[PDB]
Structure 1
Amino acid sequence: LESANYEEVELPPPSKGVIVPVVHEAFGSLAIIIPGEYPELLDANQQVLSHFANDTGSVWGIGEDIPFEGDNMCYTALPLKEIKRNGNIVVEKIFAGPIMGPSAQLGLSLLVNDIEDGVPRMVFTGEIADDEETIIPICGVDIAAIAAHEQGLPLIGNQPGVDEEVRNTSLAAHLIQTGTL
């Protein structure tokens, strides 16, 4: 029910996580989605809990229900200030609403289906189609790209503007396994 008042907090590496861009004179930021329930680290405006399909877990900081199943865990989408070289994450509060629209779906599907440990060093943006695999282009890719690049990270998606174009979740999960630049 509360929002900690802090300026930033450095947390250890999450057991796993995924980075997504948030498009807000346009403004882009990054969110990292990590296991656990930390609504208290969020601005009150981001303290919105949305759910994966079929009672299979949820995510704080996400503004719309996720149209596929989760892996039965609770997650929190945290504003990502910086990731340290040792993998520590630095989180800050931002005055903004929760993640809206479908662009976080690529990262979220990976998180619950393909990512077991660690945080891919890359930013995923894109909507997941009804087959639950094909990646659909999203809005504001150019601003998503700037946000990723400001943190020295490649943008992964399925459209002009990304750094690495991948057609479906399996190809994205594979980039996870091989690396980029």
Structure 2
Amino acid sequence: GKFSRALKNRLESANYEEVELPPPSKGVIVPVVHTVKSAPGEAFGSLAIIIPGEYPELLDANQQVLSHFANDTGSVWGIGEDIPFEGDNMCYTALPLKEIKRNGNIVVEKIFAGPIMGPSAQLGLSLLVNDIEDGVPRMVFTGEIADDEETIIPICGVDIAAIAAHEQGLPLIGNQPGVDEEVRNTSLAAHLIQTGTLPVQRA
């Protein structure tokens, strides 16, 4: 459960083959919690960017798995479970995001670990295939999407994910306390991408 700087440094010491890529045509950022059975009760966070195209070769071989959106409608390299909603008939890769730059260039690297498990990348993925057209929103999304494709189900480890977002100067977005801007549902998340920041009230 708890944030461990010691786990972070020991696992991240093995990160390798850093590379800089041009700006994605679009993308979305999500947080990942890292654990290992022999470090019980410890965890730390990182960010992943999900971009168009097939780049299994940029991933550690243990992440070179392909998971599919529902029915015919596209797939993502690097994620470990199927996605219960339709995509937009595009192929994506989920890459460890080391840095996203001023000019949009992304710095990606390999990590020694399995693929991205669990349902908390679903808010991101849903926004990516339904609402994002161009660019990468400068924010980090976290949450499971219900059957209605509107309700956002909250995650454990929101503190870990926050740390991970803040490291890179980005806000955490989700439907729970601990996040920087709360979004009750997917369509409020999509409105946030449009406004870019939370609207302000002055009386």
TM-score band, normalised by shorter chain: over 0.9
Secondary structure of 1:8 counterpart: strand
Structure 2 portions without partners, runs of 5+: 1-10, 35-41, 199-203
Task: Check whether the contact 1:23–1:29 (CA below 8 A) recurs between aligned residues.
Answer: yes
Change (3 A) 1:2 1:136: closer
Deviations 1:44-65 (CA, angstroms, capped at 9, x unpaired): 1111110000010000001000
Task: Check whether the contact 1:157–1:164 (CA below 8 A) recurs between aligned residues.
Answer: yes
Task: Check whether the contact 1:60–1:76 (CA below 8 A) recurs between aligned residues.
Answer: yes
Change (3 A) 1:148 1:39: same
Deviations 1:10-64 (CA, angstroms, capped at 9, x unpaired): 1011000000000113121100000000000000111111000001000000100
C-alpha distance in 1 between matches for 2:150 and 2:173? 15
Change (3 A) 1:65 1:86: same
Change (3 A) 1:96 1:156: same
Change (3 A) 1:54 1:158: same
Change (3 A) 1:6 1:23: closer
Deviations 1:89-141 (CA, angstroms, capped at 9, x unpaired): 00010111111100000000000000000000000000001111111101211
Task: Check whether the contact 1:2–1:40 (CA below 8 A) recurs between aligned residues.
Answer: no
What's the CA shift for 1:5?
Answer: 11
Task: Check whether the contact 1:14–1:34 (CA below 8 A) recurs between aligned residues.
Answer: yes
Q: Normalising by the residue count of structure 2, what TM-score does the alignment of the two structures yield?
A: 0.85
Task: Check whether the contact 1:31–1:77 (CA below 8 A) recurs between aligned residues.
Answer: yes
Structure 1 portions without partners, runs of 5+: none
C-alpha distance in 2 between matches for 1:5 and 1:134? 35
Task: Check whether the contact 1:3–1:42 (CA below 8 A) recurs between aligned residues.
Answer: no
- Aligned match of 1:136: 153
- Aligned match of 2:33: 23
C-alpha distance in 2 between matches for 1:91 and 1:27? 18
Secondary structure of 2:97 counterpart: strand
Change (3 A) 1:97 1:6: closer
Larger of the two Rg values belongs to structure: 2
RMSD, aligned CA: 3.1
Deviations 1:64-83 (CA, angstroms, capped at 9, x unpaired): 00000000000000000001
C-alpha distance in 1 between matches for 2:88 and 2:196? 25
Secondary structure of 1:16 counterpart: coil
- Identify which range, 1-10 or 122-131, moves more after superposition: 1-10
C-alpha distance in 2 between matches for 1:23 and 1:5? 15
Secondary structure of 2:84 counterpart: strand
Report sequence identity in percent. Answer: 100
1:40-119 correspondence runs (5 A): 40-119=57-136
C-alpha distance in 2 between matches for 1:140 and 1:26? 9
C-alpha distance in 2 between matches for 1:58 and 1:139? 26
What's the CA shift for 1:3?
Answer: 18
The total of aligned residue pairs comes to 181
